Design a protein around this ligand. Structure first.
Ligand code: H70
Ligand code: H70
Ligand code: K
Ligand code: K
Ligand code: K
Ligand code: K
Ligand code: K
Ligand code: K
Ligand code: K
Ligand code: K
Ligand code: K
Ligand code: K
Ligand code: K
Ligand code: K
Ligand code: K
Ligand code: K
Lengths: 213, 213
């Protein structure tokens, strides 16, 4: 549906403001989402200090711009952003702003899969040789995917996830997130290797090389 | 033990000959192994065209230099190299020549662990969020390590591995290697993130940055 998706853009906690070809890293996905007709609003989660970076483009973008205060951990920032979404939003699209080069086609794909399944995340096959290791440092002998963002979830599903975690006192890590505790399926939408997270100066050189084709 | 280890250096199949600060990538680990008193010999697996690259330093290095012809797949190249090792070698040290920056201290560690356990491999905790995905593209809900080289194995163990694979007609992939079929334990020696494999031009820039501290 048109104007059905609310983006929560994680830009709080800086790496995501270091420019890439003269535009702060955070603005790349911001603009990518803003041009998509499916996207109704972008809730930016950032320190108030950096609000003007997004605010300047508010009149030029075809989305509603909203803000939310960052929390202690990533999941707290998501919860904060969630409190700001349109009451009739059909899909929440959570995105790490340190991921500038997400392609429109791949956002479309994960939105569509999220709509279909209830929860979906962009992923790529893990290129490295990865093995399970037990507590004695031995290989556990017996397909693996690297997760990216967007992570797309229906709001009612996300709300119930937060409810279950707080009422039971469950532990949330980056690996064991809200969805890991739910019995609802999570689809992995096949993305592109170009959707790297930019943290080290080595990544900026790679990101420049990708934007230059 | 001194002069107990035989290195099989995989340089066949080029990325491993592109210079890093003016020295061909393959020579970095070659020299690293050559200076270690534990190392008796290096069996280089490469196309005869590139033999002179290593041969030039033969009189300057404190190891025996030997050569072997590369095979179809990685495991065939290992088998070829294995046929060349000293009959009294106590440890086989298999190394991807596309890994120039392996530290001496980490080679020492994996040699020691290989000697103790029978098989050991350098590994680092996987930094990415990695998940198991089933055939329907759904996350399988429930520690993961990225494997590097050296991969260190007692020769009698490796020989038996090759025997089991050929006599049964087992399938060998990079993930499901010789050791995966054996009941003998494989230890993961904790390495350094700097032990990257150099294949893309982006890696060369990172490798230069690492050698420059
Ligand atoms: O880890 C996730 C994955 Cl793999 C897929 C989806 Cl759809 C959502 C999450 C997630 N991440 C965070 Br932080 C929260 Br809150 C949630 Br829900
Ligand atoms: O994959 C491995 C690991 Cl994880 C540990 C060790 Cl010690 C050896 C191997 C290996 N790799 C290849 Br190719 C051969 Br042949 C063997 Br044996
Ligand atoms: K829009
Ligand atoms: K509105
Ligand atoms: K971005
Ligand atoms: K992408
Ligand atoms: K469908
Ligand atoms: K990206
Ligand atoms: K990185
Ligand atoms: K030596
Ligand atoms: K000898
Ligand atoms: K090397
Ligand atoms: K190392
Ligand atoms: K020991
Ligand atoms: K390396
Ligand atoms: K690479």
């Amino acid at each position: 549906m048109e104007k059905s998706v609310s983006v929560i853009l994680l830009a709080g906690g800086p790496k995501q403001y270091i420019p890439l070809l003269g535009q702060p890293i955070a603005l790349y996905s911001f603009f990518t989402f803003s041009r998509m007709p499916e996207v109704k609003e972008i809730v930016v989660v950032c320190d108030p200090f950096f609000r003007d970076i997004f605010e300047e483009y508010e009149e030029s973008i075809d989305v509603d711009l909203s803000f939310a205060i960052p929390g202690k951990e990533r999941q707290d920032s998501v919860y904060s952003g969630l409190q700001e979404i349109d009451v009739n939003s059909e899909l929440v699209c959570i995105h790490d702003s340190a991921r500038p080069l997400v392609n429109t086609e791949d956002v479309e794909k994960v939105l569509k899969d999220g709509s279909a399944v209830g929860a979906a995340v962009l992923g790529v096959p893990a290129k490295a040789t990865i093995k399970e290791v037990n507590s004695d440092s031995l290989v556990v002998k017996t397909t693996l995917w690297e997760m990216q963002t967007p992570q797309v979830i229906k709001p009612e599903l996300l709300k119930k996830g937060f409810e279950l975690v707080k009422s039971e006192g469950l532990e949330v890590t980056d690996d064991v997130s809200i969805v890991e505790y739910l019995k609802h399926p999570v689809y992995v939408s096949q993305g592109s290797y170009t959707n790297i997270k930019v943290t080290t100066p080595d990544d900026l050189l790679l990101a420049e090389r990708i934007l230059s084709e």
